[PDB]
């Protein structure tokens, strides 16, 4: 079972810029690796097959190249439309064809702290015997916001989830929707709910809070 | 002009089957290789299955190597996918895709031709209706902040929620969020707007939740 | 599997008042859906069939209509014999007919609350081995009437049951007889009981109670 | 003139079989459909069987698809209905209806006659008779708020037991309740009546329950 990997997660560009995008095997598959785009709500495209043979119909700003055992694709100048989900491929000279984990690229901006608001459960909800509290993070930039939930000034965990949207299309900007469930009967074993936002744009932890 | 149409799915109760097809148009179908590949939400490409031309040979992803099988008709240009003994683990988009070549054994070529994926869903579940609770603005201590409001549509199976505020008359500063699964198998999403805290006692704020696949409307005012 | 969703529960209204019935499927089944209605103690029949069309001997009163894929029952003006409860069912092209829960028809009344009595448990249940205690509700309008048990000042739930009365013919009153079941054991080791009777008639919740 | 008469019914236990049957009259019998449809208390119509004219098509619910079977006599104007391997669940009323059509396939209309539905009951429990536990009334602290007395009837089997005060003399203020069923097997009733409470130290008040099945009757005194 020979895997491939790509870099870790993702890559920040502006338009206009250089984006190196490398993927390897942890053992020889074959002489020649694939790649693919793919966008939102749509089917993967190919991009560049046989390592070096570029795809009919695809811009010559996608160019393949590679060094020692791991292969590369390399776009020459960035442009709005070219940022997507790309895959690498490796067949095995069989139908067992393999991808990569997969990359991204985002849109480069600077850092800015999220604004953050709590919302205390409704009464219909308790009335439905559950609890819910929503830790709401918007327009912040870094992907990498991180939310933990206190209940009677004690950290809690396992009991939670979390969601995140797509980067704005216009403010390039990310929203992080945190929610804290509790059931009836625990709920009201506690005073003071609260949630602590970490983010690289706060010079402090920001706290919201209800009772 | 060239195209691959996919077809079937749907939900299925676990250990169930479930069969899918998929048309080829604008191309010679017997000139070519055919494969199955599926994305989960959230996660990657992954590959199930593949076909040579001629049915020469065939090949299976080991996670379905004992539960899938694939064939196609050649004259009737389509491919087929028989999907036995679903789990949940298979909940993905399946897609229908071209190879290239018609050898399989070919490391040169690779997908250059991609259908639609359809969505396959199994679950111990029925399609159980959203319940809607609304989200107050802490007005008394955001108010120099801005306001957000917001509500909740909870436990409903069916993925495709649409919720939108003022019968899509509020569009500016929504923020919708992506559902996230629960472990009693029904999602649950949030939906926020901020708006000045000026108005929140001036315009009254409604978000319409719409569940096309049981024909629910609930429409849900939110206040301080 | 497709089911059919009707009103909530019920309608309120007054004789010569207007009164809308609708029913929509979670799924399209048919073009045409058939209205039936039912008295207490009796088989149901059919007023409506092909969406618009009258059955024969059916008054004028009953209309056909409907907007999208919402049906609806419209009555232009309520008689006292048109309280009863309506149902809707669609065909699918098959013999198995699908059914609504159906609607039901109540008169309309001034909200007021009921008189509360209590009857703790008889000699001849303890001697059984057994304990049963009463809470009843008298003449009130509304058929929502909630009520509580309590023992020994604690909530309790689970070991109760409820039965009411179908609307008075004259007074247009319901009365509600709620039971909470105790082993002689059980019954013996408390020292207070209690019921709490909450309303809509009620400015505040009545509690009563006996040793 | 147009009329449908149900026959059968009765007190069963589970994993045992009951038969029903309907006579046609009025009308020609083979001419349209027939149908099977159930009402538990409390529950809205539950649709059960159905059979076409000529029994082209035959459909049963899921609940009962592999228990109950469908048949009709045309020589002698009847539908049957086999129920087999009997449950608590499967407790309702019964009826027969006649289809407006002689096949299902038509969606244009609805059902046209019903008949006079009988009773199904399946549970592990004898006609045991009911007993008598009178509920002495609060003169102490109701004496101004009009007096309430009463008594419960408790462990009977069957439906239909009976309950008057006075041997059915009191009628007035009376407030007598459907019965509830007890996770026992047996059913437990209450039943109250309001007087004025300058009558309690007067008027005796006799609780009278008539039960037939179990050739049960039984006489309580409710008195403060």
Known sequence: ?211 | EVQLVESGGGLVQPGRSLRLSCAASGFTFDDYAMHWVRQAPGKGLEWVSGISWNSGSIGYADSVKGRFTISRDNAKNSLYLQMNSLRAEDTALYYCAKDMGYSGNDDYYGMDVWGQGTTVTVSSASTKGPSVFPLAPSSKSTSGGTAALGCLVKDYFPEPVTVSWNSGALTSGVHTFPAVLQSSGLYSLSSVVTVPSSSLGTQTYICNVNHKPSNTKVDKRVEP
């Open chain 1, 1 to 211: 079972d020979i895997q491939l990997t790509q870099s870790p997660s993702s890559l920040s560009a502006s338009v206009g810029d250089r984006v190196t995008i490398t993927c390897r095997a942890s053992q020889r598959i074959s002489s020649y690796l694939n790649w693919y785009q793919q966008k939102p709500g749509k089917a993967p495209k190919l991009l560049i097959y046989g390592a070096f043979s570029l795809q009919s119909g695809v811009p010559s700003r996608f160019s393949g190249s590679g060094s020692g055992t791991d292969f590369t694709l390399t776009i020459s100048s960035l442009q709005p439309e070219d940022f997507a989900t790309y895959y690498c491929q490796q067949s095995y000279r069989t139908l067992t064809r393999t991808f990569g984990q997969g990359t991204k690229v985002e849109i480069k901006r600077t850092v800015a702290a999220p604004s953050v608001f709590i919302f205390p459960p409704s009464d219909e909800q308790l009335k439905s015997g559950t609890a819910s509290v929503v830790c709401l993070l918007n327009n912040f930039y870094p992907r990498e916001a991180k939310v933990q939930w206190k209940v009677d000034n004690a950290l809690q965990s396992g009991n939670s989830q979390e969601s995140v949207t797509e980067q704005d299309s216009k403010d390039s900007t990310y929203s992080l929707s945190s929610t804290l469930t509790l059931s009836k009967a625990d709920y009201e074993k506690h005073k003071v709910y609260a949630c602590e936002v970490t983010h690289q744009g706060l010079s402090s932890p920001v706290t919201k809070s209800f009772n």
